[PDB]
Symmetry: D2
Subunit: 387 residues, 4 copies
């Protein structure tokens, strides 16, 4: 039951199952994983592929000779398992040089280094077949008001992304970029803190078609936002290039729980939306097996990510296919929501006395929306508590 296969497109960051368990108050509880072992174990669980930061795959400061050997071993593990690499990203946050940011560091020479580090890994990402290059600006922001002029910082951020777009264009690469928002942590406030802020920023880039979002369940929930709603707006804009799936219990530090944990009903509505919209990208998990766990718990937590997605996929499909639900959707006028408000045009609307002068506002107000019965059918379907 609910067994994932590579055709389900489930992917995992090397940094996820490979997290050694260091947190702000605690030392590692697990030994480091060889990327080759993660590829092997994830393939055995039914994963489709992996993703990486440059520094997850090649230790920072590696010589060219060491760099070549790390990539060669990794490619052999991919070849031996059929695993893919659909996405890569740059670590612009761990090294102390990035303490005030990469692309928006106050120090200009750090901003130039951040771009050179990113460009080097874009080449490698293309080599390994990645279709999406993610940017998580975790250090872009501030703890205090005078430290960061945000208009200047957004100028620098646009400059950086424009240069990266110029680079991929000049090389003929087919890879696209995805900005991963986060509202805070590790900076007190992070720039482009939500899906909305990232979508708006992209529209000011020189080549907007090259950039989308990589929203993460837990990050929008750290702002108390409705993650399915934000995904809907990203899809509406044509910008859901990639997605990070995990769990989060409300407004607190970034928990990165396995997918399905945290807000279970939001996970249900998320899967319902991705499947209804026909999202065709990776189902990527950006999660951390809790540091309480040994390696057996690591793989159990990764397996649970995929299992929960498949259970929710089943229940959401059953919800939408249920004739009683389709009747309830009509009772709640979801069919009317999908119809144009005024396809007859502005002048016809202005001349339509049924839209104002003769609109029975009291009769309309008395019509119940029937949303609670619809939602209890959704609850029954989620819980397998129908007939």
């Amino acid at each position: 039951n609910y067994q994932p296969t590579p055709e389900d497109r489930f992917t995992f960051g090397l940094w996820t199952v490979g997290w050694q368990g260091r947190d702000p108050f605690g030392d590692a509880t697990r030994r480091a994983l060889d990327p080759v072992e993660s590829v092997r174990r994830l393939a055995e669980l039914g994963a489709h592929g992996v993703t990486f930061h440059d520094d997850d795959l090649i230790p920072f400061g590696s010589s060219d000779s060491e760099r070549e050997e790390h990539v060669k071993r990794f490619r052999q593990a991919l070849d031996d398992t059929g695993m893919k690499v659909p996405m890569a990203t740059t670590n612009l946050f761990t090294h102390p040089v990035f303490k005030d940011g990469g692309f928006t560091a106050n120090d200009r020479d750090v901003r130039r280094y951040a771009l050179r580090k990113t460009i080097r890994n874009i080449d490698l990402a293309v080599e390994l077949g990645a279709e999406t290059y993610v940017a998580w600006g975790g250090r872009e922001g501030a703890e205090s008001g005078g430290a960061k002029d945000v208009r200047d910082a957004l100028d620098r951020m646009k400059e950086a992304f424009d240069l990266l777009g110029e680079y991929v264009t000049s090389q003929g690469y087919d890879i696209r970029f995805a900005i991963e928002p986060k509202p805070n942590e590790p900076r007190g406030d992070i720039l482009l803190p939500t899906v909305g802020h990232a979508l708006a920023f992209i529209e000011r880039l020189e080549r907007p078609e090259l950039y989308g979002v990589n929203p993460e369940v837990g990050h929008e929930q750290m702002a108390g936002l409705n993650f399915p709603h934000g995904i809907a707006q990203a899809l509406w804009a044509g910008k859901l290039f990639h997605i990070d799936l995990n769990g989060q219990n409300g407004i607190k530090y970034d928990q990165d729980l396995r997918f399905g944990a945290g807000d279970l009903r939001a996970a249900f509505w998320l899967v319902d939306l991705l499947e209804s919209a026909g999202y065709s990208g990776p189902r990527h998990f950006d999660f951390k097996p809790p540091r309480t766990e040994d390696f057996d718990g690591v793989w159990a937590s990764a397996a649970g990510c995929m299992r929960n997605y498949l259970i929710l996929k089943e229940r959401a499909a059953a919800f939408r296919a249920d004739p009683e639900v389709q009747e309830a959707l009509r009772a709640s006028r979801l069919d009317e929501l999908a119809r144009p408000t005024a396809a007859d045009g502005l002048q016809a609307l202005l001349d339509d006395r049924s839209a104002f002068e003769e609109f029975d506002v009291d009769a309309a107000a008395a019509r119940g929306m029937a949303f609670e019965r619809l939602d209890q059918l959704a609850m029954d379907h989620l819980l397998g508590a129908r007939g």
Copy 2:
């Protein structure tokens, strides 16, 4: 000291000082105010003008004859005081017909009514000289997942705003629209919940130049966001058409405290940003004098709004003009943040060995940012605790 005058452009909604004190758990504590008295009393306090919902000025369901008399009295009070009306808006949230929204109600006939109600008040707003027409979609959203298909809802929302833009264009009106975001309340989740989501939505409208944002201090803080940061992004996009000033204590119900209350330091950084950027629009207060207060407390609370803005304006100006602060800003490389990262171009950056191959990452990492000393100078200036 700190006495406002009309040239300070302070404005107030009729619904602010006129709030009778009804909350979810309590009846009114104050009698209704005649709009004429609010205009008179606000002018005596040094206000520049007022704003209104249609239904604040003309009671819902008024005949044309009653409507004309309400406007005539209001115009006489404006004429007798020199007060202006820079902004107006539509009440699309109080009447029960709007229980599932106005522009995105599931019922199509309600959406058409919402547009007709708005268009009627746009005409009146232009008559009274308003330059900005605000939309707060407080009922657009959902308490449950099946009740609202957000992609369909965003289609309906774009349709509505496009029709309104067609209308003002067809009439030759110079008024512009401003969307006021709010993340939640009274709906469980509201569509376009933050400044970012509204900015992104506007870029998909047919005539984007006609639409900006009207951000509110408390609303972005209900999502835990940095309000000065969001204003900076709105200014960066050229979309700060109007602003709502008030106070809020973190992530909870919408408090609408007087400006300066709530997050005092965020109020300081907000005023610093508006004045440095040269924001030229109204300094509008969307606030509610707490229902503990009688009418004397109402006017004291309104006076405090303007006083706190003027105190913060003084302290922020003193901060920026202090040579010791300018030195600290240089020590923290705010000057470097304002310089292009790579005006020499992509190829020059790729060929610059000082940006990668020869970049001393350890020496850069060792450079302290000196942000804490800068922030304590800011604190000293805010508190008047310098020399």
Copy 3:
């Protein structure tokens, strides 16, 4: 399937299904319900009983003759249905006189009135058979720091509850009191804001045995707290006298969604705890059918409250009875958690070299907790996705 009966002890406030839908931004969407109709309709759904504020049952300002007639009709509906009244409470928050509180109002004459109003309704509650008298101090608190000296306010609060305990003792009543915490709304901050603060306050009362807590799901979640954890501490203290069941989506205004909505997994763990601990009190719903709904939606939402409790009861029982779960609980050392740490005593612990000098800290640290596998078995049981 999952059909409630009166033996399930489900109860509802008159103010819940009777909520007309007025919120801070909107007028009523439903007509007022006669308490007699609510009793009848709730009995038809399988409820056990109802609860009331004084002013829900007898309109404020009623004459003695009107008061007697309202109670007489209500008692006839209870008699005709078999419905009970296990709990009553006082409205100390709607009338404007309570704008700064009841028991902790700054005005002394208001505090005396609050006590007289409460005592009158305690008599009626005893008459109708209630075993618990709830106090929700929704107006006790402040929007500003100078307005309320909290130490003085806590003195006044202790005085009020002590007088009420003296009263019930003097009358020989068997009723007990339960304090319902809420962190905020309608006051900016409410006194005794969480289960913990209420439990601590009770220990300073003259007769602590007469007072417990009435925690509400949504209220602890408005502080971001774990509601099952707080219930566990209340049970540990012997103070879970009553409970309010509903749903809430994180840190925002008090939503009062139907039970099972909001945080579904917290609802699962809550039911698991109440049933395992043998909680014998009412399963009371303090919820508001969303104002989108007509009366049919009101009763569907109330029915969903009870259905969701019964589904979760089934799944939690299946979880605890599953031999594979019992094995996982042993693998995670939940059996060891239940054993005394040092029943051998302090001196034996000090002399036990295996507790320090010879404790292999590295071998202990390497033991995985196996919590993720346990939690995925819990998820599978909740979703009915086991065998």
Copy 4:
């Protein structure tokens, strides 16, 4: 201006100025500090003393010979500066053995080790003159529901604190214990998450007089709570044994900003309360200089902690001494709040017709509370914007 001296009782944890800047996403940005240098530099800034975890002072795993030498050097630095050690604590959270807790770890042998580790450091704390021994149970809690039976965990927690009380009693030590609450991080939910939960727990200990709270500004604010209100309840209970001062911007990860940063007005009301109540304990800073800073920024941030306390002390004293404020406090009936509600007794209250039958509820409701004018006088005093 605002220069601290040792008589101001300002203290700092070794782990505060000594924080190397490692966060969940980043490596250290500063070298480790020798405790001797921190003592010297803090004394030069005007500090009164320092506090320590066992493992801050003596590296984990030290031999007795190394342990003696670390303490000897530390004592010489204290002797050479006049610095004191008023508080000590145990690190029960960094080492991987504590991944599921210390006192409430599921593994019994870990719980016994946690107690032995604590007892060893209590002896050292007494040796160094500490009057308070703090417990921060940062690992006590859970990420999932099945992992931790909270009633069993609270049994184990009571057992641990009771044994510690037995130990100090048996040794004749005068030191007392203080529990430091935190709602979450690094565990998904932490046991005893707020001041209220800790106060309530203490009342169930065998020797409650030996235990109080050590509340931290940022921790209560991570639950969205009013920190001055919680301190007031702790003082009301006689349990404010110690306090952690810092700054926090709302509901997010634990920021540990310098005191005065974050919620500035809450810092003002906190200082007003501590000084009015005559709190006589250490003014302890549990803060982290942001990792953007070099060592010069470390000492600037520490200096700002003390400066902000002294500025706020001045402004709060000026507020309370201002005859215009004293008049406003009377206008708002703060004098009536301090008077007993019914010193005439229950029967007199029941017989007082002015408390009910003849109480003019409308005249009382019409009395404005005048809270907004009072709060603007408080704002003017905080900002130095009076005469």
